[PDB]
């Protein structure tokens, strides 16, 4: 069933999400941080100016936050994403590839912030179920049946493709219009504890140099 | 030259200016320290040849 | 020569069409893996 | 008042070692995409 950390609050209370960045973020990571906020309906953007990690987690817990999102970059290119579940974990770290922001589209327009429909594809292994559990509870429970906004997490060889679309039910099918952003996200670390606790036990780690790392699939 | 540095260049008296000339022309005599006193085109052609071979791969 | 790691996946037009098919294809059947109030 | 001629190229374009660097970058850049 739903994990113990999520079992108490699964389908009872809506989540409270905090999205932040590393110290002295470049400009783009600021915009990219926003697009993550707009992706999660109950997310709020906070500036990490001189904030210290034990101070950040403790301050967020006091305010009642459910999850924290911290983002990293390299020359303004989003490189990593980490999600920490309060009060005692787990903490999942993610690596971003082929990131394409919505500011990077001309005349795109504004997002619809209705509670979105969710699709989780090709998640089979037990670890696959765990990561799905982590990602599912970022969003509100009970999206409206006629909600036009859909978010999909598609697992293709441990590279989860994230897409955002809006659909219109036609007389002879559906037509989906992508809103973005596009980015591929892969798990490489999962710890039983908050992100601050570097000594927290590791539930799972990605072995990158194992000879079968070339062809090993975990999700 | 034993010439005060705060002075302007206009004021200088004759003897000190002559001394300065002697200092410049005879540094070693007054103990001035000594310490104070195609291939690229070939590489370009080789890079072009590598580029052409690289095009040949494709 | 050998490689240690997976190559980063590439989003070709065919990949998008295959992905976009599944996104459309699901919606006919209304099969959305969603959290619901407990 | 003083009069001074303008400095310009008759046909503007929007040393050799420097060109070697740019052609390296273009030649450099292509190599990863094949390797990838």
């Amino acid at each position: 069933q739903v994990d113990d950390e999520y079992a108490a609050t699964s389908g009872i209370m809506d989540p409270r999400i905090i999205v932040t960045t590393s110290r002295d973020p470049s400009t783009r990571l600021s915009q990219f941080a926003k697009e993550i906020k707009l992706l999660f309906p109950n997310a709020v953007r906070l500036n990490r100016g001189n904030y210290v990690m034990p101070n950040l987690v403790d301050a967020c817990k006091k305010s009642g936050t459910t999850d924290l999102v911290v983002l990293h970059e390299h020359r303004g290119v989003p490189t990593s994403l980490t999600i920490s579940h309060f009060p005692h974990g787990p903490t999942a770290q993610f690596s971003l590839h082929n990131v394409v922001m919505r500011h990077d589209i001309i005349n795109a327009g504004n997002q619809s912030e209705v509670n979105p429909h969710l699709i989780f594809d090709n998640f089979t292994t037990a670890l696959g179920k765990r990561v799905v559990c982590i990602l599912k509870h970022l969003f509100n429970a009970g999206p409206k049946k006629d909600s036009e906004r859909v978010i999909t997490f598609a697992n293709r060889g441990d590279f989860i493709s994230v897409r955002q679309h809006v659909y219109v039910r036609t007389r002879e099918g559906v037509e989906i219009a992508e809103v973005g952003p596009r980015f591929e996200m892969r798990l490489f670390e999962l710890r039983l504890g908050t992100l601050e606790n570097k000594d927290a036990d590791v539930e799972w780690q990605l072995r990158r140099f194992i000879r079968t790392a070339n062809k090993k699939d975990y999700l | 030259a034993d010439v005060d540095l705060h002075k302007r260049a206009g004021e200088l008296t004759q003897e000190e200016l002559e001394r300065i000339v002697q200092i410049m022309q005879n540094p070693t005599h007054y103990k001035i320290p000594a310490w104070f006193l195609t291939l690229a085109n070939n590489v370009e052609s080789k890079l072009r040849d590598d580029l052409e071979r690289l095009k040949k791969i494709r | 020569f050998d490689r240690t790691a997976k190559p980063v996946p590439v989003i070709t037009s065919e990949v998008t069409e295959s992905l976009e098919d599944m996104i459309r294809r699901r919606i006919q059947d209304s099969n959305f893996d969603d959290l619901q109030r407990r | 008042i003083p009069t001074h001629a303008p400095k310009y190229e008759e046909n503007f374009n929007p040393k050799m070692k420097a060109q070697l660097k740019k052609e390296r970058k273009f030649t450099m850049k292509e190599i990863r995409k094949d390797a990838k």
């Binding site: 589209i105 001309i106 596009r182 | - | 590439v10 998008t16 | 995409k33």
Partner: peptide, 27 residues
Amino acid sequence: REEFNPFEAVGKPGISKQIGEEQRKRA
């Protein structure tokens, strides 16, 4: 269907990396 895929509203230049790969595929 084709019109409403801006990544392939229109994107900034250089977003999509289709031209290289199809040319690599031909090779």
